[PDB]
A = this chain, B = another copy of it.
Amino acid sequence: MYIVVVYDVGVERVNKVKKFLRMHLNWVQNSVFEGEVTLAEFERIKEGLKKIIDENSDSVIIYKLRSMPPRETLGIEKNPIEEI
């Protein structure tokens, strides 16, 4: 899979999700990560995120894609496509 991960997390866990996702996926916007993973990394990422998360005040959408998607970007880009 290639995933894009976008989350809405409270200030008490938001620093934790960022540090965790940044060791599996590329950071491209605030609250948004993407990259290639395997089913190992995937459910590692996924449960790894559930442990971190209060599933009762917090939301993660992980879009499960074939491959890296084309995109378009308005405004202050934070991570040039090349770097991802």
Contact = CB atoms under 8 A, between A and B. Distances in A.
Nearest to A71: B63
Contacts of A72: 46, 61-62, 64
A37 interface: no
Most interface-central of A28, A55, A61, A62 (chain B CB within 10 A): A61
In the A-B complex, the 3 residue pairs with the smallest Cβ-Cβ separation, listed nearest first, are: A55-B75, A60-B74, A8-B30
Given A8-B31, A30-B59, A59-B73, 6 more contacts: A46-B72, A50-B74, A58-B76, A61-B72, A64-B69, A65-B69
16 contacts: A4-B63, A6-B29, A6-B31, A8-B30, A8-B31, A32-B61, A55-B74, A58-B75, A58-B76, A59-B78, A60-B74, A60-B75, A62-B71, A63-B69, A64-B69, A64-B70
